Design an enzyme around this catalytic site. Structure first.
Site, PDB file in Angstrom:
ATOM      1  N   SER A 123       0.595  -1.208  -0.212  1.00  0.00           N
ATOM      2  CA  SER A 123      -0.033  -0.202  -0.084  1.00  0.00           C
ATOM      3  C   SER A 123       0.926   1.432   0.120  1.00  0.00           C
ATOM      4  CB  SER A 123      -0.980  -0.062   1.155  1.00  0.00           C
ATOM      5  OG  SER A 123      -2.057  -0.912   1.094  1.00  0.00           O
ATOM      6  N   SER A 170      -5.773   3.867   4.510  1.00  0.00           N
ATOM      7  CA  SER A 170      -5.403   2.786   3.556  1.00  0.00           C
ATOM      8  C   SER A 170      -6.666   1.826   2.977  1.00  0.00           C
ATOM      9  CB  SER A 170      -4.222   1.738   4.029  1.00  0.00           C
ATOM     10  OG  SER A 170      -3.152   1.233   3.120  1.00  0.00           O
ATOM     11  N   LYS A 226      -0.119   3.499  -3.064  1.00  0.00           N
ATOM     12  CA  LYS A 226      -1.252   4.530  -2.682  1.00  0.00           C
ATOM     13  C   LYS A 226      -1.097   5.900  -2.896  1.00  0.00           C
ATOM     14  CE  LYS A 226      -4.182   0.885  -0.664  1.00  0.00           C
ATOM     15  NZ  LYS A 226      -4.388   0.046   0.479  1.00  0.00           N
ATOM     16  N   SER A 264       1.572  -3.323   4.042  1.00  0.00           N
ATOM     17  CA  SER A 264       1.761  -4.659   4.563  1.00  0.00           C
ATOM     18  C   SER A 264       1.203  -5.456   3.414  1.00  0.00           C
ATOM     19  CB  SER A 264       0.896  -4.767   5.792  1.00  0.00           C
ATOM     20  OG  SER A 264      -0.542  -4.678   5.398  1.00  0.00           O
TER      21      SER A 264
END
Length: 261
Positions: free
Chosen positions: A43, A103, A46, A210
């Site tokens: 992530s 997230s 992002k 993660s």
């Protein structure tokens, strides 16, 4: 022990593979460890998707307030914000905020879809001079983090350089740079990662990520009280698919490389 020796020792104790890049903007000096090797971003990617939409918004004053419909079928797991908005809308700004601060995977996917697919995120990174970043998949499959798989990877140094450009440098117009920084500073998911290795009062913006193979990542911009900013990428991954994630490793690495500063 030198900082390099300390990082090597941390990796040796870790049961995996540690990647660190710190850029000290006081003097452009760096603390690099496996910084040209590839790691799955998870992530942390992002940030690039949100920034790509911010770039578009430079030339479209209505973009950030554009409505995006959220449907039950858009939920993909780990979507704490988008699930609150099913049957309603979220703006592109709200999707950026959710993707970065919570997230939210659905938010990430809406950003990617808006841009025209993962390849458009890669093209945006390339436009910033990042020769390394690649986005190949949507969420959640971008988190598979299989050792040696090049999909959805970058290197610690490339990501540190690009994060510096995005947050402190030449990538974005001023209002959009400031918006990205606001989002990163308001992240809720990073308490136990880089932040836990720093003096408690330092101002920090970060994005965690993660995945499988115990892949545990964080990218941060750090504003000391009496010093120029630091940009820090800490990536970590393990050999076994179902390894636990290890944000403690990231905190420990952050403490090592920010000592003295």
């Amino acid at each position: 022990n030198s900082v390099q020796q300390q990082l090597e020792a941390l990796e040796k104790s870790s049961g995996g593979r540690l990647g660190v890049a710190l850029i000290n903007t006081a003097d452009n000096s760096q603390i690099l460890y496996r910084a040209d090797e590839r790691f799955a971003m998870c992530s942390t990617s992002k940030v690039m998707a949100a920034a790509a939409v911010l770039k578009q918004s430079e030339s479209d004053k209505h973009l950030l307030n554009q409505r995006v419909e959220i449907k039950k079928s858009d939920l993909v797991n780990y979507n704490p914000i988008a699930e609150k908005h099913v049957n309603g809308t979220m703006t592109l700004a709200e999707l950026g905020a959710a993707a970065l601060q919570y997230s939210d995977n659905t938010a990430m996917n809406k950003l990617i879809a808006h841009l025209g697919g993962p390849d458009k995120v890669t093209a945006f990174a390339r436009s910033l001079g990042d020769e390394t970043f690649r986005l190949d998949r949507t969420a959640p499959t971008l988190n598979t983090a299989i050792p040696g798989d090049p999909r959805d990877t970058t290197t610690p140094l490339a990501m540190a350089q690009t994060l510096k450009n995005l947050t402190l440098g030449k990538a974005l117009a001023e209002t959009q740079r400031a918006q990205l920084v606001t989002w990163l500073k308001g992240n809720t998911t990073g308490s136990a990662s880089i932040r836990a290795g720093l003096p408690k009062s330092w101002v920090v913006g970060d994005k965690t990520g993660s995945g499988d193979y115990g892949t545990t990542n964080d990218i941060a911009v750090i504003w000391p009280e009496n010093h120029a900013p630091l940009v820090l990428v800490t990536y970590f991954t393990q050999p076994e698919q179902k390894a636990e994630n290890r944000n403690d490793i990231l905190a420990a690495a952050a403490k090592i490389v920010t000592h003295g500063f």
